[PDB]
């Protein structure tokens, strides 16, 4: 199936409390695999996935040097944006970036992307054509021009189509046992009483990987999507995810409702009842 290499970057200024905090967190699909935190006792790029032990010392030194270079670059960016927006030096501000590429099952690039945000709002983004930028405001229009004159889009395209793709393939290979596995979810239903002769039936799905899953409740064969409670799929601390979906039904009518779980680790979907 498709796979992706994504980096979530954050730069937050802490006026009065010293230098801003800088963080890089990398992901291959739903798995965190590398991280850098400027607040760390010893700021170094560190592995977050066991399979990353296959990379030599030179890998960690290079990535650490780049991250520190990025830290300095974003320190300046925070100052620059105060100018663009005419903001005072005393406030805390945030720059967020999501950068990455995705390859199909055969390892060829499907798409590459890069998007910036300032204080929680879109700032500038690379367009699907990987050649042009789109600014969310006049400030971003300043950056757009700078980048066009520096030929930045070409440099980024080189990375997205090259480095990003090749390293993504490499990570998928070295960590294939972890990244290409499939953990089948284990599901169960809980019952909770409520006032006015009604009950809450909750359908739980635990220990699955990849994170993609579909949990639905049905009555008369119709899926009750509109009348359904649900949490976003969440990591459970060991590389797997969980999710639950609930429905409040009339007391004594619980047996007319079934929970269905669809996941790639299930040849046939699970059907549960209380």
């Amino acid at each position: 199936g498709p796979h992706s290499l994504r980096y979530f970057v954050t730069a937050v200024s802490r006026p009065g409390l010293g230098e801003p905090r800088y963080m890089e967190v990398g992901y291959v699909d739903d798995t965190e695999f590398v991280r850098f935190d400027s607040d760390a006792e010893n700021p170094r790029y560190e592995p977050r996935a066991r399979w990353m032990e296959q990379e030599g010392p030179e890998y960690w030194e290079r990535e650490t040097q780049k991250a520190k270079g990025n830290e300095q670059s974003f320190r300046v960016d925070l100052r620059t944006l105060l100018g663009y927006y005419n903001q005072s030096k005393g406030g805390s501000h945030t720059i967020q970036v999501i950068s990455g590429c995705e390859v199909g099952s055969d390892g060829r690039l499907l798409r590459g992307y890069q998007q910036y945000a300032y204080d929680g709002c879109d700032y500038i983004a690379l367009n699907e054509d990987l050649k042009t930028w789109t600014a969310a405001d006049m400030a971003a229009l300043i950056t757009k021009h700078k980048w066009e004159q520096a030929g930045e889009a070409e440099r980024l395209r080189a990375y997205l189509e090259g480095t990003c793709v090749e390293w993504l393939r490499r990570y998928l290979k070295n960590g294939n046992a972890t990244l290409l596995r499939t953990d089948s979810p284990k599901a169960h239903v809980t019952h909770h009483s409520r006032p006015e002769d009604k009950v809450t039936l909750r359908c739980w799905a635990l220990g699955f990987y990849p994170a993609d899953i579909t949990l639905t409740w049905q009555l008369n064969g119709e899926e009750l999507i509109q009348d359904m409670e649900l949490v976003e799929t969440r990591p459970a601390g060991d590389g797997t995810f969980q999710k639950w979906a609930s429905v409040v039904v009339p007391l004594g009518k619980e047996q007319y409702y079934t929970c269905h779980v669809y996941h790639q680790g299930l040849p046939e979907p699970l059907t549960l009842r209380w």
Binding site: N70, S73, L81
Partner: peptide, 8 residues
């Protein structure tokens, strides 16, 4: 492998 970002 991360990218070396350009300044804004």
């Amino acid at each position: 492998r991360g990218y070396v970002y350009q300044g804004l």
